[PDB]
Structures are given as structure tokens and as C-alpha cells.
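Progress note, sequence design subtask.
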């Protein structure tokens, strides 16, 4: 056979979270919300680093953004929505022949497990990250087609079993393995304590540390929430903790590619799927998840 991908093979992103807004509430008065605002301040000193006791910028002021809960609210509220969109096998810019046999080759993908892991990542509150430190309690509320689910203590790095995540994941899988769309409205409550610092998304560009803001209100990037949602890959070589689904399985925090140079990257399995190579339940899920994430797969 020896069929290769078209020059311009592109797939649209199918999991679309909104940006997340950050509010302050009291744990037992979650209705009376107030917006958490990003402020700007000046800091004296720069943490000394190895060597260089006396530098130029050590005794230099730095301008940084910050965000905190007010002193009369003890709980951080994080609100966002996530729209799952179907037709995950219909390419945006790819040809058709190469993408249609890939579609029929990945038609046995365990969509139930993919949806369960996505929804679990949402319900376990992975995207909360630094905002989980020093929290007395974390609660997640998910509404979907007039159905409210509450989650309290789920292990983040173990996709443990529970029935509400399954009920949500069945609708999500019906959309992902079919047509249409479905929206989950998500709220996270972190009992942090009055005045506690909260951690919006960081931006890297004047300011020595910038925070994401929507009209001045502390916010989290949609793409960081998406990265938290797709942290489902436990099928790479020598797998321990889940990693975000990425063509080469590479992470940005510690900078390692867990799926490079071992015949387990996205493109190798892609070509094999097209050319009739036997595919495991795991790599079918991995290829379909990369199609769900979207990207440019050619050139």
C-alpha cells in the first residue's frame, strides 16, 4: 500500500473550554459572589541564584501582578464551561482518502474510556493545580442538560471508578463518537481561607510577572484547562502518571518526550492505522485523542 498523509492535513479542536473566571464566595454562601481582581505591586529584591552574589538587578525593584481572596471571603470559585463537539474524524483541511481509511481504522476506538477520562479530569479538578495547595476542602459541581452532579474527593492521578462521572461520560461519548455537541457547566469551590492568594494563569512577555485577566478579573487560560482535560495518556513506555495527549507525548514543565524515538508517536501509529497495521485498544484511543485535540498532521 504505502499511503502517506496529504501535505496539509489539519483537524479542528473538539474539546472547547471557555476561559475560567475566578470569584470569591463564602463556603456556605456560594450565591453572593464577588470578582477576584488582578492587582499590580512592586517587590524589592530578586531571589539570589547560584554564583553571582552581587548582580545588577538584585537590588532592583520588580513590578508583578497578584491576586488574592478578599479578607471577608474564605472560598475561591472557578467557573468555566466545556463544549464537546462531534464529527471528530472529519478533517478540516485534509484530503479525504487518507483520512477516510483512518476513520474506518479508528472506528473501534473505546470512546467510553476517553470520555470517562476527560470527564474525570474535569470532576477531579486537575486544572486547579496550585490553587489546591492548603485547601481544607474542594468541591466540583457539573451541570449538563438540567442534571447537577457534585464531586468531593477523587484521586487526581488515579482514574478511580464512580457512577456520576460515568453518567456524564456516556453523553460525552455519544457526542464524541457521533454528531452534535454537549456543554458541561463547571464550578470549583476551594476552601482556602480569608485573604488567601489565588493563582490565575501566568503570562510571559515591563512586568516581571504577569497574570491573565478578563476585564481586570483574575482568569485562567482556556488552553491550560484543555491541557488539564486531555491529561489522560497512561499508555506510553514505562507509564506511571498520566500525561497530556500530545503527538510526541512531550511535556513542557520538565521538558521530556515520552513518545519519541520508540515507534509510539502519533504519526507512526497514524501511518500504521492507514496502512492496515494491527492497533491496540490503547493506541486507537491515543490516535483518536490526538484527532480530538486537533493540529497539523502533514507537510
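Output:
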Amino acid at each position: 500500500t504505502k499511503l502517506k498523509a496529504p501535505a496539509v492535513l489539519a483537524y479542528s479542536r473538539k474539546i472547547n473550554p471557555t476561559n475560567a473566571l475566578m470569584f470569591a464566595v463564602n463556603w456556605s454562601d456560594r450565591d453572593n459572589t464577588t470578582a477576584v481582581m488582578v492587582g499590580t505591586k512592586t517587590v524589592a529584591g530578586t531571589q539570589s541564584v547560584r554564583g553571582n552574589p552581587n548582580d545588577a538587578d538584585k537590588g532592583n525593584i520588580q513590578t508583578v501582578n497578584f491576586a488574592n481572596l478578599p479578607h471577608n471571603k474564605n472560598t475561591l470559585l472557578v467557573k468555566y464551561n466545556v463544549k464537546f463537539v462531534g464529527d471528530v474524524f472529519k478533517a478540516e483541511l485534509g484530503g479525504g482518502e487518507y483520512s477516510n481509511t483512518l476513520q474506518t481504522a479508528l472506528e473501534n476506538t473505546d470512546f467510553g474510556t476517553l470520555a470517562y477520562r476527560y470527564v474525570y479530569n474535569i470532576a477531579a479538578g486537575r486544572t486547579l493545580w496550585r490553587n489546591r495547595v492548603g485547601a481544607e476542602s474542594i468541591e466540583t459541581v457539573i451541570t449538563v442538560n438540567d442534571q447537577t452532579f457534585t464531586f468531593s474527593d477523587l484521586l487526581v492521578n488515579e482514574f478511580d471508578e464512580d457512577v456520576d462521572v460515568a453518567e456524564i461520560a456516556d453523553m460525552v461519548a455519544g457526542v464524541l463518537s457521533g454528531e452534535g455537541f454537549v456543554t458541561l457547566k463547571v464550578e470549583h469551590y476551594m476552601l482556602l481561607g480569608e485573604g488567601s492568594e489565588v493563582f490565575p494563569s501566568q503570562e510571559f512577555v515591563k512586568l516581571s510577572k504577569q497574570l491573565f485577566d478578563l476585564n481586570g478579573q483574575a482568569a485562567m487560560h482556556d488552553q491550560k484547562i484543555g491541557n488539564a482535560i486531555r491529561t489522560i495518556d497512561t499508555w506510553y513506555e514505562d507509564a506511571t502518571t498520566p500525561i497530556a495527549v500530545e503527538p510526541y507525548g512531550s511535556v513542557v514543565r520538565n521538558g521530556v518526550a515520552y513518545r519519541a524515538g520508540n515507534k509510539t508517536d502519533l504519526f507512526t501509529l497514524m501511518d500504521g492505522a492507514v496502512n492496515g497495521k494491527s492497533l491496540t485498544e490503547e493506541d486507537q484511543m491515543f490516535v483518536t485523542a490526538n484527532l480530538i485535540r486537533g493540529g497539523v498532521f502533514g507537510g
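The CA atoms of residues 105 and 273 lie 6 Å apart. Work on this subtask will continue into the next period as scheduled.
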